[PDB]
Amino acid sequence: QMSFTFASPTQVFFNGANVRQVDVPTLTGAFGILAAHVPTLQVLRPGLVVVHAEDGTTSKYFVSSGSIAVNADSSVQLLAEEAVTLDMLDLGAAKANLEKAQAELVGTADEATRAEIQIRIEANEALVKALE
Amino acid sequence: TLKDITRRLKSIKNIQKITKSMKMVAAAKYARAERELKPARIYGLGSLALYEKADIKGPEDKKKHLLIGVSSDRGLCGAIHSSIAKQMKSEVATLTAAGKEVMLVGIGDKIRGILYRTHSDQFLVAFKEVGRKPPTFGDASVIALELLNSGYEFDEGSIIFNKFRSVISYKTEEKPIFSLNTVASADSMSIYDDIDADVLQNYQEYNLANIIYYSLKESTTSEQSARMTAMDNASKNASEMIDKLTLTFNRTRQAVITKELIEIISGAAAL
Amino acid sequence: PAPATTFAHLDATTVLSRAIAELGIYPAVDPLDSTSRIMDPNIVGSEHYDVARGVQKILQDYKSLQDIIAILGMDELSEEDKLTVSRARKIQRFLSQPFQVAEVFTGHMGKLVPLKETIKGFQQILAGEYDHLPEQAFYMVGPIEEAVAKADKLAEEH
Amino acid sequence: GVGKTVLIMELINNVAKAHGGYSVFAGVGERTREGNDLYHEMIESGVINLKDATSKVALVYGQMNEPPGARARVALTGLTVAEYFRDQEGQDVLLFIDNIFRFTQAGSEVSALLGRIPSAVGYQPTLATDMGTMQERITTTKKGSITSVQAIYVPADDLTDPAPATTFAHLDATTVLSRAIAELGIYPAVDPLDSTSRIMDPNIVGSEHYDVARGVQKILQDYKSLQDIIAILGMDELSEEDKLTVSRARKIQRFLSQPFQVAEVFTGHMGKLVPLKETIKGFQQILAGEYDHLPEQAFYMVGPIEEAVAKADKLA
Numbered sequence A: 001q002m003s004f005t006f007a008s009p010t011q012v013f014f015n016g017a018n019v020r021q022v023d024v025p026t027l028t029g030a031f032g033i034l035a036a037h038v039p040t041l042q043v044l045r046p047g048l049v050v051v052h053a054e055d056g057t058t059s060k061y062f063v064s065s066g067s068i069a070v071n072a073d074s075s076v077q078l079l080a081e082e083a084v085t086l087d088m089l090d091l092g093a094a095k096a097n098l099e100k101a102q103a104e105l106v107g108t109a110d111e112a113t114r115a116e117i118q119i120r121i122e123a124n125e126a127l128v129k130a131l132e
Numbered sequence B: 001t002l003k004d005i006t007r008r009l010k011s012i013k014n015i016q017k018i019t020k021s022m023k024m025v026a027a028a029k030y031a032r033a034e035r036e037l038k039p040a041r042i043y044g045l046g047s048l049a050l051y052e053k054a055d056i057k058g059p060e061d062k063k064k065h066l067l068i069g070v071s072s073d074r075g076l077c078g079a080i081h082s083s084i085a086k087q088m089k090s091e092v093a094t095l096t097a098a099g100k101e102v103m104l105v106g107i108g109d110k111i112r113g114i115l116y117r118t119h120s121d122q123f124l125v126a127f128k129e130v131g132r133k134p135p136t137f138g139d140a141s142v143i144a145l146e147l148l149n150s151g152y153e154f155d156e157g158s159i160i161f162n163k164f165r166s167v168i169s170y171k172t173e174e175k176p177i178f179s180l181n182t183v184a185s186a187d188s189m190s191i192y193d194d195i196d197a198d199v200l201q202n203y204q205e206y207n208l209a210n211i212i213y214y215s216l217k218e219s220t221t222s223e224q225s226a227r228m229t230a231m232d233n234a235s236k237n238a239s240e241m242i243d244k245l246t247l248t249f250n251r252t253r254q255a256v257i258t259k260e261l262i263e264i265i266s267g268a269a270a271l
Numbered sequence C: 001p002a003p004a005t006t007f008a009h010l011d012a013t014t015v016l017s018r019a020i021a022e023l024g025i026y027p028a029v030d031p032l033d034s035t036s037r038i039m040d041p042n043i044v045g046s047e048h049y050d051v052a053r054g055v056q057k058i059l060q061d062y063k064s065l066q067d068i069i070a071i072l073g074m075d076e077l078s079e080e081d082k083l084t085v086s087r088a089r090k091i092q093r094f095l096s097q098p099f100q101v102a103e104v105f106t107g108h109m110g111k112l113v114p115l116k117e118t119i120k121g122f123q124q125i126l127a128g129e130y131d132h133l134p135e136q137a138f139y140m141v142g143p144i145e146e147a148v149a150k151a152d153k154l155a156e157e158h
Numbered sequence D: 001g002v003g004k005t006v007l008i009m010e011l012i013n014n015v016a017k018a019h020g021g022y023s024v025f026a027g028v029g030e031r032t033r034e035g036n037d038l039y040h041e042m043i044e045s046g047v048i049n050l051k052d053a054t055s056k057v058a059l060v061y062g063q064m065n066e067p068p069g070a071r072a073r074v075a076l077t078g079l080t081v082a083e084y085f086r087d088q089e090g091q092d093v094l095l096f097i098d099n100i101f102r103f104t105q106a107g108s109e110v111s112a113l114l115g116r117i118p119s120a121v122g123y124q125p126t127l128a129t130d131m132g133t134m135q136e137r138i139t140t141t142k143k144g145s146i147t148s149v150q151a152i153y154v155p156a157d158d159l160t161d162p163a164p165a166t167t168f169a170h171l172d173a174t175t176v177l178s179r180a181i182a183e184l185g186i187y188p189a190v191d192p193l194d195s196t197s198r199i200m201d202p203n204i205v206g207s208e209h210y211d212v213a214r215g216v217q218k219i220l221q222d223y224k225s226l227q228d229i230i231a232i233l234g235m236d237e238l239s240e241e242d243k244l245t246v247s248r249a250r251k252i253q254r255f256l257s258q259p260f261q262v263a264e265v266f267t268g269h270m271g272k273l274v275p276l277k278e279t280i281k282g283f284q285q286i287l288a289g290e291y292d293h294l295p296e297q298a299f300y301m302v303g304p305i306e307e308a309v310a311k312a313d314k315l316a
Helices: A094-105 A111-131 B002-053 B079-096 B108-117 B137-148 B180-185 B187-191 B197-220 B224-269 C002-007 C041-072 C079-095 C100-106 C116-126 C146-158 D005-017 D032-044 D068-089 D101-113 D129-135 D160-165 D179-183 D202-230 D240-255 D274-286 D304-315
Strands: A019-026 A030-035 A040-043 A048-052 A058-063 A064-072 A074-079 B064-070 B101-106 B126-128 B157-164 B169-178 D024-029 D057-063 D092-097 D145-150
Touching: A019 A040, A019 A074, A030 C079, A030 D179, A040 B197, A048 A111, A058 B180, A058 D092, A064 B002, A064 B197, A064 C100, A074 B002, A074 B108, A094 A111, A094 D092, B002 B169, B002 B197, B064 B108, B064 B169, B064 B197, B079 B108, B079 B157, B079 B169, B079 C100, B101 B108, B101 B137, B108 B126, B126 B137, B137 B197, B157 B197, B169 B197, B180 B197, B180 B224, B197 C002, B224 C041, B224 D068, C041 D032, C100 D024, C116 C146, D005 D032, D005 D092, D005 D145, D024 D032, D024 D101, D032 D057, D068 D092, D068 D145, D092 D129, D101 D160, D202 D240, D240 D274, D274 D304
Parallel strands: B064 B101, B064 B157, B101 B126, D024 D057, D024 D092, D092 D145
Antiparallel strands: A019 A030, A019 A048, A040 A064, A048 A058, A064 A074, B157 B169
């Protein structure tokens, strides 16, 4: 019953395929979408996504910042600017990135640029815990 | 004259060579273009899936308007820029006639050039260096940023582009773009939850970026094809002219030989 | 040598062309090769003279554009260039005329356009008063009234 | 580049075998080096026999270092030694003229020497009658026939030049030996699309022959079309008929290849001359779509379709 469309701008992982349950890390919380979910539209934040296939096995991706929409017709569109697998990413570079990021954070002092460094930090940390 | 025909023949010959090379490279680009278009098409339509499943009727009351036109910076593609131009200017005429002010963004130097002396007074911003490289998401993020940092919060909007139908045909399409106000006011959106000004704002901004990306991809493709077929036509017509001018060249050189021979003979006969 | 020598003996040469007659335009007079000695604003008046010079200017512009028009197509011309080509083709067609002695060929009845109708029709086509009519509405007509009538017939029937 | 001496020698051989016709080769205005080369190639390939009385061709040569009178009458000498065979033996003689343009230009030089006023371009005033008084003797009388194969040079690549334009009035057929076809590896490299014949109409070769040849021609044209559309680099098959005809036409344009007997010492392949009806029938089959299961390379350097299917079996 689930019409899932996990789709990066230059790739497509699902298109109308039937899966049993997905998880999404929306700005306002990480939750799970199943069939006949109440209609929702949200924007994402960096972190994992785990598609549970009808055959039970879970395909794990890592999205950067997209948008999810669960419609009345059980259609679930998940458009993520950067969709990845979990072997495609390393651990040391993510760690070093977050370290230098917070270093510059307490270094940087302007409000807007502060928010930018903080967003880089949150992305890198969602990634660092999604690592291992 | 023999030398005039020789010069004109050489000119048309190198022109035909140029057009054949342009056709070749344009087809080469169109390969990757239509390779990238399909997943991006799935993507950019999954974005609009909600405004379809929600039937956002659109503001019937509001005054201002924003009109985007997708083209490239390179002419010599066909009637692409001309089509976008005519639809954009007709639409602006009919909206300003109906009492609705409109300001216009032009993606692509060609559309800005061909519509700047027409509607400069009604013009927001333009973008260039699109068309040389295969458009990506970064393009859309940038155009959307400078559409929002514009401060011009439009009542509504329409993007106009050349929907790729296939290698021979393209259709000038006009996609709608709603504002926060009426997407909030739309009673249909009462079925969706957890929504307020903030999350609908984020979603509208990101969907603006998505639709601009998908339109750029729809227009990059549907331009390499038009360019390929146009250069095919150019090379064919150039070779037709080459054949006819070669006939005339042979005719003229035979006539020249005859005339010089008759000169020599009449000169020899006077002795 | 025979035509070239004859040219100097005439006051008003009218030069027919095969390339024009292959377009179906009769009489096949070449507009850019027919001259006259009374084509002088102090004899035919400034109205007639200016209309004639403008017709010839637009036809010359069309001729000079023809090469890249047939190489690249019209889709690459400037919008002003598309306008000059449109008016030039219209003037081409309006220059043709059914002949009373050519009913056997044209099927139409011969028209005898007096001078002021000619001047006025061409002045109007130049000014742009017929940018909406199809070009085939001017082929083989009398005065411009018949051109507008033929355009109306084409628009209603087709 | 393309093998033309081989085609000439094979025509000599075939016409001597199929019919009983001897051949004459006129060497109008020919390079002495090329004449010696041809003499030795025809000795090697068995058409000329230096030790027996089984030679199938008589040679007449007027070289390039000979006065215009010689080069102008040498074609008539060859024509006479062929007319003997025709009118006194009832044979179907084959007369080759290794260049007819040099015949025309030798007549031009002769008339220039005699002080006559030249005509269009410089040719003799008697160009048409000089060509006619020669070509009118190459006919089919009630006693026999003389069929003439005349190599043609087109000066300045103008097919409207008076010499080729006065020669084309007498031509009945035309074969074009393209180097492009030879680079594809087809022998004889006869361009199947640029070769013409005036007896192709159904009133002369029958509707069966006419329709088989017309179909082959149309399929080859459509294959070159689909080739320039395959140049898209998007070789797909959104049409079943397109690739069907692509392989049909490739099998055809390889079936228009043949091992010649005269090239039996250079290549182990045996020379297979094929009758007319068998050619018509084989191309009829390939056009009807039958030999699809057969691979492509079993239609290469083969005789009739029997040899084709025998080879196809023998591929394994």
